[PDB]
């Protein structure tokens, strides 16, 4: 219930943070190459 939805939302924000980190790494690598 409340615990499950809290866990799901926290996992969603963690996944968004991880995707942001991956995007920053991709941009840094493109800057490396250029």
């Amino acid at each position: 219930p409340e615990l499950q939805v809290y866990y799901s939302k926290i996992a969603a924000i963690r996944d968004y943070k991880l995707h942001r980190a991956y995007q920053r790494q991709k941009y840094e690598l493109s800057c490396i190459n250029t």
């Binding site: 941009y27 840094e28 493109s30 800057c31 250029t34």
Partner: protein, 383 residues
């Protein structure tokens, strides 16, 4: 009446014309700090260069590195004792150099920092190599953003400028040219180059500065020159918050008249970044596009030109206008997006290639502009 306000036309460049440009960058230029609380910041050259790398402009422009200027080359303007003290001084032994520092006007408003000689030599070498490549005719434009510090006198370093590489560049251009027109955009008056070339005809030290309560305290409409240099000192003092349209309407007539009468063979165009909105000390309200319209108009003639850097007490706006001007020099318009770089997080909260004007009291009444244009035309017809 001579001044006439006109709407700001969109940027247009000739596609048929091809221009060669030799950008100059010394990677070690942006590593010397004036102090903790000093407006001068050499980092802007490095950030601008990173921007030009990221925008893809390298595929249509030439870029090299200028060898540092030798001491004898650097002494083409300044006195022997001045350069000797500037080399011998260090932030750690000024106790034995107190009298020399007092005499040379250094330490209080312009302080001694390690690597000072390296920075001065880098700027001087950039200017001298740009002038030398201009003489050889290989490159039509010799961009040297590192230098442009035009506040250095013959024996004094006032206005945060220790060495005036513009004088050396003009000298090495004059070794093969009879008349070179010098254009200033820095808010402060170009006291150093003006004093150096105040008694000569072979140069046209045109300026666009602001008159008021400042450190230079020069740049009046009265000063026109001595000897053969009479009426050869064009000054256009202005006031607070001159906007883009009126700045263009002031610049274009005057430059057109100079090119029609003076007829120079090369142009030493200063491109100081302290004439923009949001500056630390500059009172103007010019936007980046207004800062680049002057350069585009100068370029449209089709003569060799040496673009230099100079002042600019902020970093992001100065870098943005410098990269925009470099792009415009290639007959290429740069998009508003600032592609990611190591110093991306600097560029404000807008993250767009634009500097936006602020609301300041536009003291520049049209009557003042008409009067100054009439005076300039009267003193210019004598050439």
């Amino acid at each position: 009446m001579v001044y006439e306000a006109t709407p700001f036309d969109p940027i247009t460049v000739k596609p048929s014309d091809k221009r060669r440009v030799a950008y100059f960058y010394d990677a070690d230029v942006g590593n010397y700090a004036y102090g903790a609380g000093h407006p001068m910041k050499p980092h802007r050259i490095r950030m601008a260069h990173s921007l030009i790398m990221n925008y893809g402009l390298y595929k249509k422009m030439e870029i090299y590195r200028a060898k540092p200027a030798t001491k004898q080359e650097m002494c083409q303007f300044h006195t022997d004792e001045y350069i000797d003290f500037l080399s011998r001084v260090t932030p750690d032994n000024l106790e034995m150099f107190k009298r020399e520092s007092v005499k040379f006007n250094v330490g209080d408003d312009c302080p001694v920092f390690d690597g000072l000689y390296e920075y001065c030599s880098i700027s001087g070498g950039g200017s001298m190599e740009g002038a030398a490549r201009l003489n050889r005719g290989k490159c039509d434009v010799a961009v040297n953003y590192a230098g442009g510090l035009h506040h250095a006198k013959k024996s004094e370093a006032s206005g945060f400028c220790y060495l005036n590489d513009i004088v050396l560049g003009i000298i090495e251009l004059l070794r093969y040219h009879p008349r070179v027109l010098y254009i200033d955009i820095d808010v402060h008056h170009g006291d150093g180059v003006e004093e150096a070339f105040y008694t000569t005809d072979r140069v046209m030290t045109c300026s666009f500065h602001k008159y008021g309560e400042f450190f230079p305290g020069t740049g009046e409409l009265r000063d026109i020159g001595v000897g053969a240099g009479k009426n050869y000192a064009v000054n256009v003092p202005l006031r607070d918050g001159i906007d883009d349209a009126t700045y263009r309407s002031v610049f274009e007539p005057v430059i057109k008249k100079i090119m029609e009468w003076y007829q120079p063979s090369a142009v030493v165009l200063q491109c100081g970044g302290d004439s923009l909105s949001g500056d630390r000390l500059g009172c103007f309200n010019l936007s980046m596009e207004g800062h680049a319209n002057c350069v585009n108009y100068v370029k449209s003639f089709g003569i060799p030109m040496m673009v230099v850097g100079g002042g600019g007490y902020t970093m992001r706006n100065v870098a943005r206008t410098w990269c925009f001007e470099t792009g415009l020099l290639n007959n290429v318009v740069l998009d508003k997006d600032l592609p990611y770089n190591e110093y991306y997080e600097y560029y404000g909260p807008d993250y767009k290639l634009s500097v936006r004007p602020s609301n300041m009291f536009n003291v520049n009444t049209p009557e003042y502009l008409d009067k100054v244009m009439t005076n300039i035309f009267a003193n210019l017809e004598n050439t």
